[PDB]
Write a protein that binds this ligand. Structure first.
Ligand SMILES: NC(=O)c1ccc[n+]([C@@H]2O[C@H](COP(=O)([O-])OP(=O)(O)OC[C@H]3O[C@@H](n4cnc5c(N)ncnc54)[C@H](O)[C@@H]3O)[C@@H](O)[C@H]2O)c1
Ligand SMILES: *P(=O)(O)OC[C@H]1O[C@@H](n2cnc3c(N)ncnc32)[C@H](O)[C@@H]1O
Length: 322
């Protein structure tokens, strides 16, 4: 029947979107994805009663919002403390060593690039994207659902036949250098406001009231974690949770690594610092996390921040000189 044919084309598109944006390993040429997007759109136009709200053709709201509504996160987020030196980082490891009851040998960290963008939270209900918000201050943010729906590597439907009852994906939205340079060039040509750096371009784009404008902004999500998680037994380490997010079609940064012990973690920090803008987008620092979730829970938090993670920040771009 027509409905099943429609759903088979949409499923095919969602698989190509996963391969291209999440796996970075497309199985078909762009031209095939393009023509299939056209074919789906033509069939939906012939049968509009079968349009679905999570179809690949439905990313872009037709009208601008009047303003952003405030959102209170259902589960507030911790704040993240910063380290700026190797001594600060080693002090943070030592506090863990001094607090854990049974200190494993080695102590594994999941180590991530800290994307220079805007932090966001995206809620999927029985697999469907239903709302998204800015992180804000970790307690209150703004509802940016219509903007987040435009982002090409953000799935509208999770890639699984058995999605959690509810899943909150937390991540950073950023704008790679090439897109950022195109945006600034377009803006100057039209005498519209430009952006001082990609971080501000990503933040300003996510506060664009008209999602037709936001769709033209080349934004990318990289997920860093999970809040609400109902009807799902999540893996017991953070890195396996990230691999699981990838498995269901959520984009995660490919430079994340497991590191054993303080010294390997500093190896990671120095390596990503060397790559802080050679990968085609800006990385602000690293977020270094105890990988084992039971150890995270044991370690807890103080003053709003986990004892089990630290952001070891690079020097600001303006400190980098001859
Ligand atoms: N090889 C692959 O599997 C694959 C998968 C996803 C994206 N891509 C590539 O990524 C690039 C960026 O993709 P993008 O999402 O910005 O789209 P885009 O704006 O670059 O458009 C890509 C194609 O999709 C068509 N299209 C876009 N929105 C449509 C809609 N609502 N209805 C009907 N057709 C629509 C366009 O006419 C165009 O032919 C494109 O070059 C695309 O081919 C490739
Ligand atoms: P940025 O300074 O835009 O980050 C703001 C807050 O978001 C949370 N956060 C961002 N990135 C990460 C990762 N990779 N892991 C965990 N938490 C992250 C932190 O609360 C940042 O302070």
């Amino acid at each position: 029947n027509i409905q099943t044919q429609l759903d088979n084309l949409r499923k095919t598109l969602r698989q190509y979107e996963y391969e291209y944006h999440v796996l970075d390993n497309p199985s078909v040429p762009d031209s095939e994805y393009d023509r299939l997007f056209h074919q789906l759109k033509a069939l939906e136009l012939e049968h509009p009663e079968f349009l679905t709200s999570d179809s690949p053709t439905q990313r872009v709201g037709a009208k601008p919002l009047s303003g952003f509504s405030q959102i209170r996160h259902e589960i507030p987020m911790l704040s993240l403390d910063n380290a700026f030196s190797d001594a600060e980082f080693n002090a943070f490891v030592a506090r863990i060593e001094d607090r854990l009851i049974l200190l494993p040998a080695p102590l594994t960290f999941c180590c991530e690039p800290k994307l220079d963008g805007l932090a966001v939270s995206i809620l999927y209900v029985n697999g469907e994207l239903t709302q998204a918000a800015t992180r804000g201050d970790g307690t209150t943010g703004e509802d940016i659902t219509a903007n987040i729906r435009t982002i090409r590597n953000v799935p509208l439907q999770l890639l699984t036949d058995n999605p959690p009852a509810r899943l909150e994906v937390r991540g950073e939205v950023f704008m790679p250098h090439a897109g950022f340079e195109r945006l600034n060039k377009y803006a100057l040509e039209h005498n519209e406001k430009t952006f001082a750096n990609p971080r501000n371009a990503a933040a300003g784009s996510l506060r664009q009231l008209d999602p037709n404008i936001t769709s033209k902004r080349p934004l990318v999500l990289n997920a860093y974690g999970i809040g609400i998680a109902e009807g799902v037994d999540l893996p017991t380490t953070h890195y396996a949770r990230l691999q699981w997010l990838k498995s269901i079609g959520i984009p995660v940064n490919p430079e994340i690594r497991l590191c054993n012990g303080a010294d390997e973690v500093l190896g990671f920090y120095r390596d990503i610092q060397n790559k802080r803008s050679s990968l085609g987008y800006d990385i602000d620092g690293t977020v270094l996390k105890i990988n084992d979730i039971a150890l995270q829970n044991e370690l807890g938090f103080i003053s709003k921040a986990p004892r089990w993670a630290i952001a070891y920040k690079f020097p600001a771009q303006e400190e980098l000189t001859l």
